[PDB]
Amino acid sequence: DKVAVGKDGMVATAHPLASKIGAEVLKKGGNAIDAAIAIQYALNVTEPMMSGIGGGGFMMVYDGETRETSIINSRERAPEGAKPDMFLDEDGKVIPFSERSRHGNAVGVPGTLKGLEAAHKKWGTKKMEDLISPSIKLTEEGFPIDSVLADAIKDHQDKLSKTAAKDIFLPDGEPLKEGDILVQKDLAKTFKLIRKEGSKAFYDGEIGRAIADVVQDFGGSMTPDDLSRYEVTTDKPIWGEYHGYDIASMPPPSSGGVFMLQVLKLIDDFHLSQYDPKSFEKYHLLAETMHLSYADRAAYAGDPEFVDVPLRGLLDPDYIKERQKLISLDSMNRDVKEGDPWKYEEGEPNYEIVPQPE
């Protein structure tokens, strides 16, 4: 169902089979981290277009024993051979999105699997073989695909037709339909290897060499050395306050936490519950606010290992009032440049502000 209640645990995921797998882990006395690991594996099989061991993520965990909130950050990294201008052609023109998004230069070193291992080292109570095994079975023996996956195959058939996906997802040249069984024998083999050997098979082993080789085949520069260099990181949340509640969200290298917080701070003083949820006034004020926050994001957000993000200035109450001068029901604001949050910081940016085509 879409809504559930429970006394002793709760799972909510985008695929019924993954939700059942994670609930079973909890029913058998695993903890929420054990369940989350099992769910990631399950979604990699059943919702393969959306996530898995070929990507990365941000796993926020509140630890009920220590009372600390931390984030396992498995975001991908550019390989060493990546270059600032790799998405431009030799005349400086931006390579079209459809093209550059299919090319090997787009592939970051994957983190998800190392993320699951870091979460298991810190919090796990069930062995990793138990947590991966239900997904080995879904991969090896198959499952009936849902509508979202059937639609995705159809909509991405051209992309898939160019790669080793095609024999699995487009058999005999036709997308699998809703309810057809999807069998993923190679993915099963990979999960068995990880079950046997751990992530070394991926980051310093046979899977890794095949990743590097296919990245290079598709024009990218990733090497096995790129793979063996990778490790996840652990981040503290960015915190804010709203409506009497404390909100923990994702810091840089996401824009999400800070800009979600900034939107809430910008709109809070307009007391939007005075307007119907489907009113002109709510939608206008939201649109005006988003234009401001997205403009600050374009200017000031990037990986904080490299660039200085003005987190304090972006959320300073004075800076919020500066931006709010531009948010009104009286008129449409067309002055949508970034503001100057560095007025409310000790330092300055260590980069330029560079317009990007839409």
Next chain:
Amino acid sequence: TTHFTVTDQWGNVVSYTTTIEQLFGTGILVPGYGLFLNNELTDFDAIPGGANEVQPNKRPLSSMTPTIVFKDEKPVLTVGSPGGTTIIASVFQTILNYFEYGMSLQDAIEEPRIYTNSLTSYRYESGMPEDVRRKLNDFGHKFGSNPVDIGNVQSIFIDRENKTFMGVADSSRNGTAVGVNN
């Protein structure tokens, strides 16, 4: 991208957003190994020089927003969503609807969302009234005339008054919430 969340009997709370960038990422499947490879690096700016330029070993800017809301030091609500740059919009609108409008968690999630990152880029969900949309356009906005689904919020509410959890999955995919009673 996908967002999921878990709570257990010991007070641990997980809110996890995870991705390969586009649907199927690059589309490249690792030969012999069955896994799709991300296109994450296109989240970097294509024209270098800025905060989010490409560099070796750098992480491309994300918009993923796994969140936990707390009251008096304890978790009360998890929120997160897929959608790239729209994630900020999904998460903030869910939080506004639940806390400022006082909606149920499910109504807060299902309320039509809007997104706009510039004067020339707008999205809205079905249920935004048509007249209101057109009036906003008259005023200077640039909503199209077709709706699109925005995001996919899974959330758990931690009901400390009743010692229970409430999970919700968004209608925009076939997600489910499953409780556990030991």
